[PDB]
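idk why but the lab printer keeps eating my pages so im just putting this in chat instead. protein + zinc ion:
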Amino acid sequence: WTATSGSCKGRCFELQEVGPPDCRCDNLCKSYSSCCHDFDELCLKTARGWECTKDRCGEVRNEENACHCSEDCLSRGDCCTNYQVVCKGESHWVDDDCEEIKVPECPAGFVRPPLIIFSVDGFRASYMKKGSKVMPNIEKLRSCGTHAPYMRPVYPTKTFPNLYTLATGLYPESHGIVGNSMYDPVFDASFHLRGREKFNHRWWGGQPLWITATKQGVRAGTFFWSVSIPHERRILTILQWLSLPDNERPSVYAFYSEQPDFSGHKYGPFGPEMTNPLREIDKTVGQLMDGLKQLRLHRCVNVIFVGDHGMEDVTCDRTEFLSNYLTNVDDITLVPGTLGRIRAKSINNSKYDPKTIIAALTCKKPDQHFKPYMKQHLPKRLHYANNRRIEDIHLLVDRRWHVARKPLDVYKKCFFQGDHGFDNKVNSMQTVFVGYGPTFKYRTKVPPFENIELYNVMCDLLGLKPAPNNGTHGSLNHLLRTNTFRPTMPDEVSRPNYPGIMYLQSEFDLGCTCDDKVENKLEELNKRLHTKGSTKERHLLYGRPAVLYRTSYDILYHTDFESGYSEIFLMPLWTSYTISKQAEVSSIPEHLTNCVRPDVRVSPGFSQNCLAYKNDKQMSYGFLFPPYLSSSPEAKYDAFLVTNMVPMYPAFKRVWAYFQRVLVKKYASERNGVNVISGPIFDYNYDGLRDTEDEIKQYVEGSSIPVPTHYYSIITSCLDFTQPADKCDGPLSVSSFILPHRPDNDESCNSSEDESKWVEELMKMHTARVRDIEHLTGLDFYRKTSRSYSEILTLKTYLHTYESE
Ligand SMILES: *[C@@H]1O[C@H](CO)[C@@H](O[C@@H]2O[C@H](CO)[C@@H](O[C@@H]3O[C@H](CO[C@H]4O[C@H](CO)[C@@H](O)[C@H](O[C@H]5O[C@H](CO)[C@@H](O)[C@H](O)[C@@H]5O[C@H]5O[C@H](CO)[C@@H](O)[C@H](O)[C@@H]5O)[C@@H]4O)[C@@H](O)[C@H](O[C@H]4O[C@H](CO)[C@@H](O)[C@H](O)[C@@H]4O[C@H]4O[C@H](CO)[C@@H](O)[C@H](O)[C@@H]4O)[C@@H]3O)[C@H](O)[C@H]2NC(C)=O)[C@H](O)[C@H]1NC(C)=O
Ligand SMILES: Cc1cc(OCc2ccccn2)c(C(C)(C)C)cc1Cl
Ligand SMILES: [Ca+2]
Ligand SMILES: [Ca+2]
Ligand SMILES: [Cl-]
Ligand code: NA
Ligand code: NA
Ligand SMILES: [Zn+2]
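predcted complex ->
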């Protein structure tokens, strides 16, 4: 119950929400059916529309009008936004030359430049170039301010997941808004776009910007705008708030537009009907900027023009139906559309089986336009698993496609021509970023970055300390003229041991054999030096990685590679090696096929053993430093040390072997040398974070050798490829991956074919940021370079996407 017969007199768009059943006058009241009786009359005035005209200039104040043209309007803070232009011979903001804003130019009483977030729904990244002729206000912001060619949304590329990620700096798995539709088994409650449950606070995790601001003494405008409040009224409300007294005035504001998304769904992303919504958004920006200029805030406010996701062409006829794959379709619930999430219709049905559902959905038709996954097998870059609201079974749907349960779902609901929600690497899902103001740089283009980073920056813009989040604070310092955050490198927690020769061959009973007892004072001094780290400057180019947790490990040097060997996990945490453009690929000689050699620097008790692999009929082994890339027949023996061995399923070895034999050399050729760091990852609870030893669910049979869930590689070279990787004087270039360590290649539908037809495609799918690997390993890379730390932070957040331009 709301006693809706109090009054909004003097209270229109109050910043604090009053306790029901007192009636409300805030921008959320419409949504709760709780506004006072007179809300429309007082708060949603429309009389005479939104613009001053020649005849209204210096009129007599009529408090019924939507906005005012009377002489007193400036100090009342409620002029139409074009008041000065029509009535005082001023120019529109867009017609003014842009001039560098070197310092904030703010009215007295402003403690800090306000931040206005101008968010646009469905604003695909290529609209900036393609709609440029019809968006002059946006184009001035873009060319005069700081902009990226595009900004990567999070997965799924839907509205609430992305807007709440902008507000929190968190992945959807962590903030809890994991889709536009959801069931939470702990609450036993559902979340839907339509309706009221979505307003319950238990859905919304983390700490959004407006709470961060409030807790820290910075006042915030409201971020949610009820759909029936027109855009002109949202702008005028922001401008009115900006005229509040210093103690009452918020420092952060948000505008939101439903367009161009609303139209994009109906007409497709480039439908001829799309020009008009883009014009109208631009006019709204015009209104805000003219409004700010009138208030003398146009060189004071920092403005962020940001989208939540793009929009792709999608029609009813490009729909895959689960009824064409499954016989048991009625025993499942599907969250449908541009992604699929499957669960059992009833938890009383113990006959339901996820294994048989996956297999029935796997590679069944030649052009199948979705791929099933257990959530933990999704590309790690999606960060889409560690939440109970995310179903165990997931369908990644091809761009341009939908998945539905039965055909009747689609024609008893062609309506739409656009949709979004796909993999966040997809070009059509990329959205926009522009920052304009005293705190942003002038006429500066920055590289594409992910929207998870913006929360930190908006905190910097407001002098707030960000709550813990998934951004890498400092990675966006190059966007900013001032207020940069000066991060320090994390301290190393465990220092390595540097073992020398401490064990005789006969102390090892590992069941390993090697054909290696084949016999110089020149090359004996030489080999000792390699074992002491003589070539380390060649293979370890950026310093050794720091281990940021408590553990026991050894550094091991070799002619061709260096490793950090964990005495706890019995394998390297990392292995580093550099392959020059000129390097040669050789094969594993016949006499060395099954060779594994004890490492006399490392105790038998801290070593793997060959017998375990023999006994484990499912599990084989591979090497981190590939024997194929050995520098000489004698150095090749190093690659067969038991300390370079890792557990690998035979199916995975097909992947790994092609990577090491073919692709490393290809990249070295193309990139002019590469430095490679490879290692295991253990993430059995799929939280994106390094497992402790007591979290490991699988071991090589009858041993304490833990089985990785993934293998990573970080591949670094000179950004200026005219310099070799090992002699690079400037910025670096990186690509990385996190490959799932799986006992089958069911993920790759063409896997019966030659590795050259499928392997590289799989690696691309599992592309990753160095930062993702850091989370998963507790290592910190690039500790010793000649580059600035903020620059290295940007490099560690880089994702190589393998999309075209
Ligand atoms: C992206 O950035 C985020 C933010 O930094 C990273 O997430 C953090 O990760 C931390 C480590 O996993 C985690 O710390 C834990 O917090 C527990 C307290 O949690 C509450 O308080 C915080 C702070 O206000 C709050 O944010 C949490 O909110 C979660 O839960 C509510 C409702 O459940 C949701 O509304 C909300 O969306 C959020 O959900 C997300 O997080 C939880 C996990 O916390 C997931 O389950 C969800 O799926 C979802 O993703 C909480 O309300 C604290 O209790 C933990 O401490 C245990 O573990 C330590 C290990 O040191 C142990 O020593 C302690 O004793 C304790 O163990 C006991 O509990 C165990 C588990 O029940 C039990 O097995 C033991 O035997 C013990 O009894 C822990 O410290 C932190 O909560 C989140 N923060 C957020 C916002 O998610 C994230 O990792 C980053 N991602 C990547 C890839 O880097
Ligand atoms: C800029 C912005 C706006 C916004 O909400 C705007 C909105 C969306 C849908 C319907 C009505 N209003 C939000 C949420 C989290 C959704 C409150 C976050 C941000 Cl960062
Ligand atoms: Ca949206
Ligand atoms: Ca983990
Ligand atoms: Cl969804
Ligand atoms: Na085996
Ligand atoms: Na296959
Ligand atoms: Zn949409």
